[PDB]
Amino acid sequence: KAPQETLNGGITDMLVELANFEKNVSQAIHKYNAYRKAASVIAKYPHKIKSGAEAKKLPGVGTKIAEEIDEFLATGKLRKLEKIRQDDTSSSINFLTRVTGIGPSAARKLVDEGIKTLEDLRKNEDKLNHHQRIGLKYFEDFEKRIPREEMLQMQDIVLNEVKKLDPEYIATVCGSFRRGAESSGDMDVLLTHPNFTSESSKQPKLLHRVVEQLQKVRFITDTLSKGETKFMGVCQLPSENDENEYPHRRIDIRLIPKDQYYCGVLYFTGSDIFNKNMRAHALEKGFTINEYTIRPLGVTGVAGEPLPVDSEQDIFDYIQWRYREPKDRSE
DNA sequence: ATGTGAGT
DNA sequence: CAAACTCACA
Ligand code: NA
Ligand code: NA
Ligand code: NA
Ligand code: NA
What we know:
The protein is an alpha+beta fold. Helices cover 46% and strands 12% of the residues. The chain contains 15 helices and 9 strands. It has helices at 9-24, 29-44, 52-56, 63-74, 79-86, 88-97, 104-112, 118-122, 130-137, 148-165, 175-178, 205-216, 261-269, 272-285, 312-318, and strands spanning 146-147, 170-173, 183-184, 187-192, 220-226, 230-235, 249-255, 287-289, 294-296. The chain has a 5-stranded mixed β-sheet with strand order 2-4-7-6-5, with helices on both faces. Strands 1-3 form a two-stranded antiparallel sheet. It has a two-stranded antiparallel ribbon with strand order 8-9. A hairpin with a 3-residue loop joins strand 5 and strand 6 (230-235). Helix 1 packs antiparallel against helix 2, helix 6 crosses helix 7 and helix 10 (148-165) crosses helix 12 (205-216). The protein starts with 8 loop residues before the first helix and ends in a 13-residue tail after the last helix. It binds sodium ion (4 copies). Residues 175-177, 184, 186-188 line the site of one sodium ion. The site of one sodium ion has 7 residues, from helix 11 and strand 4. The structure holds a DNA duplex. The PDB classes it as transferase/dna.
């Protein structure tokens, strides 16, 4: 058990790095696609590949990748990948990409202009948009881990402010934090209200009222993006008078229809492996579960009509599963 | 009925 | 989990 391999990680590591190079250093979408699928199919392969020709029999694996595998099998390396690794251009592109807001397109532009380091970026803030400038301002903070006792404190300020606005609101911090992790890198809040449903007249101000109120108490300090259903921004714990100021953190807040809430909470509580195991069991029972709904499945293996859900428990009830605590949703 | 770049 | 989905901006 077993579970995943583990058996050809060296090959698949090579191909994924090659894909990332071609996607976002070269502008070569087809090469990127081909490496990605070749990596994915090899990763499923239950035997330790001993030649390029053995890999070649797989669909997705052609002559060029088979030859790269020989070189990598024979030597312990691929010269082509050692050169990419040593390449200043590609390394600079990948570093700049760590800034939230900067992606391959803006990274290519910046490196072509000689912008490669944080210091370089901190001297050319006029080349960046608001998202990227906020990404840069807090670059160090946004790579920092977030202790659990911090997440909890963050939890009951957004939970409390939301209540004092209107007790009808339901807000939940999901992600690994919900499933019990000793640290996260981000806070992921799911928000809803009884008179926003998938059939209703929308009412955009549900999300804005809570965002505004969190800025008002100085929890939210910056905005990366903000629409009628989705907010992404920055928050901070209140510092103690003077002394140590807490690092700034990424927080997302998402408004979801009431009749779709618990499927979202379920889906964004994870974990990824749990989720896969759960939708797999659902299929065994004749149900399909996604982030929005759970639907029965018909004789022809296809049906719909969302089932009523006002609880995580309800989803479990339908697939005849004992309710699983988030605390034990690792697998 | 804008297209792309990003982030999740 | 990739894919689709939001949102920002040129
Ligand atoms: Na990125
Ligand atoms: Na300048
Ligand atoms: Na999280
Ligand atoms: Na996240």
